[PDB]
Design a protein around this ligand. Structure first.
Ligand SMILES: O=c1ccc2cnc3ccc(-c4cn[nH]c4)cc3c2n1-c1ccc(F)cc1C(F)(F)F
Length: 345
């Protein structure tokens, strides 16, 4: 009849009540969002006298254990005293409350998907995109710190928050799906739209898969729409192929799940497999040049005449993206050099 002395529901979630005051410190205001992990609530820390976001993990061992991994990584990042640290959301502290693990983060406005929807999915400017791109690259540079070597493993608009409604700063959230560099354990990783080719092909992966995600995200930022919106993995790959063409032979020859998408011809070359529903342009004929509208006033021609949106500006943006969307994770551009690109001058 009751769960956790009546504090929980049948989904092991803590029943959030507005006005409730935790530990004579946190004044619960309202629910921010839900997730598999549990809930995130907006609360006022009367001690520090500031708003905070509390991530209330579900009262069950499986989610508790996963959250402790997140606490480990977040605390690990906190110990490294650099200024790049400030593009990761700050874990202030954590505590147990009524059998729930609670993580206290800084309070941020809204996520990057919310910003897109506010544009009615028409995107934001190349100028705002540049600011976001530089911070993300810096964030990825921080995660590439040898002692950290952290793969976020789930970069997407939803997991990128705006620091202030009137400022251009962003921060990355949700390191619950994250782990450090190591031997391959998991294979079905990342959100589909932003899933790297090496993951789709069932190959070994590293920190480069986050760079791939970033490339997808940045395009989506300026256009307002996902670059590769696959309804499944096969559709996802075919959308990727539409833009970038057939992946190199030296990659496909070593790909365990290559024949889920491709066909090895008698001459040793690879072609797409004939699927089913749906219809795709020939490989590489959906150019990023035309998606971005480099010479046609940007996405939908809505940036024509706008400053910071010349052909030269768009060419710099396109070039950086294509370096981020390299099929080869070993030659794919890295954070340190992404930041040195001409797009960021
Ligand atoms: O969607 C938003 C909108 C605003 C917002 C504000 N603060 C947040 C603080 C922390 C987190 C978070 C930390 N771990 N996982 C999520 C998430 C925060 C947050 N989120 C967010 C982002 C990712 C996510 F998986 C869940 C949320 C949630 F809405 F708060 F639940």
């Amino acid at each position: 009849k009751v769960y956790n002395d009546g504090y929980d529901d049948d989904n092991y979630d803590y029943i959030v009540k507005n006005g409730e005051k935790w530990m004579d410190r946190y004044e619960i205001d309202s629910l921010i969002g839900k997730g598999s992990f549990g809930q995130v609530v907006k609360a006022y820390d009367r001690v520090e006298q500031e708003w905070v976001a509390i991530k209330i993990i579900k009262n069950k061992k499986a989610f508790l254990n996963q959250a402790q991994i997140e606490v480990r990584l977040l605390e690990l990042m906190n110990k490294h005293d650099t200024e790049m640290k400030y593009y990761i959301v700050h874990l202030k502290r954590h505590f147990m409350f009524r059998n729930h693990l609670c993580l206290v983060f800084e309070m941020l406005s809204y996520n990057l998907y919310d910003l897109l929807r506010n544009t009615n999915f028409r995107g934001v400017s190349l100028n705002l995109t540049r600011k976001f791109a530089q911070q993300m690259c810096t964030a990825l540079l921080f995660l590439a710190t040898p002692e950290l070597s952290i793969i976020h493993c789930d970069l997407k608009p939803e997991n990128i928050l705006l620091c202030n409604p009137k400022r251009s700063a962003i921060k990355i959230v949700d390191f619950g799906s994250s782990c450090q560099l190591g031997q391959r354990i998991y294979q079905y990783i990342q959100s589909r739209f932003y899933r790297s080719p090496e993951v789709l092909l069932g190959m070994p992966y590293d920190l480069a898969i986050d760079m791939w995600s970033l490339g997808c995200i940045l395009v989506e930022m300026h256009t307002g729409e996902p670059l590769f919106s696959g309804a499944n993995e096969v559709d996802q790959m075919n959308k990727i192929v539409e833009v970038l063409g057939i992946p190199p032979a030296h990659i496909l020859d070593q790909a365990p799940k290559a024949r889920k998408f491709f066909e090895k011809l008698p001459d040793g070359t690879w072609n797409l497999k004939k699927t089913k529903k749906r219809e795709y342009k020939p490989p590489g004929t959906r150019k990023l040049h035309n998606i971005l509208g480099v010479e046609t006033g940007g996405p939908g021609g809505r940036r024509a005449g706008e400053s910071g949106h010349t052909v030269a500006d768009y060419l710099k943006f396109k070039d950086l993206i294509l370096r981020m969307l390299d099929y080869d994770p070993k030659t794919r551009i890295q954070p340190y050099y992404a930041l040195q690109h001409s797009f960021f001058k």
